[PDB]
Amino acid sequence: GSHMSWVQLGSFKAAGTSGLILKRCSEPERYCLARLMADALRGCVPAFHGVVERDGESYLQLQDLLDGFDGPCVLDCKMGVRTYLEEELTKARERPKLRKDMYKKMLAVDPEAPTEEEHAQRAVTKPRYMQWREGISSSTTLGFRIEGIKKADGSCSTDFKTTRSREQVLRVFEEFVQGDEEVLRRYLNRLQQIRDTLEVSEFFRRHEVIGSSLLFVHDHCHRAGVWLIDFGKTTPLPDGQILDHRRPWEEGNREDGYLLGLDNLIGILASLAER
């Protein structure tokens, strides 16, 4: 139906127009969505209708991806081997911003994870925190991680911070599709067509794609869709430089492993379909 409906039962506000949603405007994301509407990836991302003012503040006017579905099931998959910008590494060296909450989260998952100095600081840098999150999840090894699942009743989970092995990820998707062969086949067809689009996209070869997700949406009528969302940390490469999006990240090469992630994700869903 609508995302704001699920919200009722952060950055998102109800739109005036049926089948639209408002997302708080960020300059990187507005730049990306404008380019994407003119790119091969146009159909792989939510429709971007421009910017509107509400309570004297700027919102992206977006397609509500849940609008076509009857009681949608949603899964958010964060794509990439790296989940922070390289500029965040520089700032953390020259001008660190210590984070006490991020320290507490770590203790909880692994008490021996923080160093003697982080313990004494009771705090860590964001990039250190994001690197640790990448290693305890599937991000480092598979190039994606499950962030959360939602359902139209209000029922939601984000309890995936240690979902890491290929088989752990497969078991989350197995539970998400609840044995619906038609939804799984449609998800796999959509991912195959997205991969093909990414591999020819002018936008994609010219941009570092960090912190974006693939949003999986399906319903009990067997409707299934997948879209790329969240371009808040997607930045152009300089001087017409390009990425392959599969090779390992090494500080300075700005590689995101996005397609390593999509290759693995397709392989897991193809595996699930043969079980």
Ligand X SMILES: Nc1ncnc2c1ncn2[C@@H]1O[C@H](COP(=O)(O)OP(=O)(O)OP(=O)(O)O)[C@@H](O)[C@H]1O
Ligand Y SMILES: O=P(O)(O)O[C@H]1O[C@H](CO)[C@@H](OP(=O)(O)O)[C@H](OP(=O)(O)O)[C@H]1O
Binding site for ligand Y (CB under 6 A): 126, 211, 233
Asked whether residue 126 is marked as a ligand-binding residue, the answer is yes
Asked whether residue 178 is marked as a ligand-binding residue, the answer is no
Tell me the C-alpha distance between 102 and 161, whole Å.
13
DSSP state at residue 248: P
Tell me the C-alpha distance between 79 and 227, whole Å.
12
Q: Which residue has the tokens 């390289």?
A: 86
Say whether residue 3 binds ligand X (CB under 6 A).
yes
Among 22, 36, 65, 272, binds ligand X (CB under 6 A): 65
CB of residue 120 vs ligand X: minimum separation in angstroms?
Answer: 30
Q: Which is nearer to ligand X, 21 or 73 (CB)?
A: 21
Burial of residue 28 (number of CB atoms within 10 Å: 0-12, 13-18, 19+) = middle
Tell me the C-alpha distance between 268 and 173, whole Å.
9
Which regions of 80-134 does DSSP assign to beta strands (E)? none
Q: Which stretch binds ligand X (CB under 6 A): 227-235, 247-255, 256-264, 267-275?
A: 227-235
Say whether residue 148 binds Mn ion (CB under 5 A).
no
| 51 C-beta neighbours (distance < 10 Å), count | 14
Tell me the C-alpha distance between 196 and 188, whole Å.
12
Among 225, 232, 246, 263, binds Mn ion (CB under 5 A): 232
Asked whether residue 150 is marked as a ligand-binding residue, the answer is yes
Say whether residue 256 binds Mn ion (CB under 5 A).
no
Interface with ligand X: number of residues (CB under 6 A): 18
Among 219, 230, 255, 256, binds Mn ion (CB under 5 A): 230
- Per-residue string for binding with ligand X, 159-188, x by CB under 6 A? ------------------------------
In sequence order, what DSSP letters do the residues of 8-35 get, joined into one string?
H---EEE-SSTTEEEEE--HHHHHHHHH
For residue 208, give both structure tokens. Answer: 């570092």
**Residues in contact with Mn ion by the rule CB under 5 A:** 230, 232
Q: Name the site residues for ligand X (rule: CB under 6 A).
A: 3, 10-11, 21, 46, 62-66, 74, 76, 150, 213, 215, 229-230, 232
Q: Residues marked as binding for substrate?
A: 78, 99, 126-133, 233
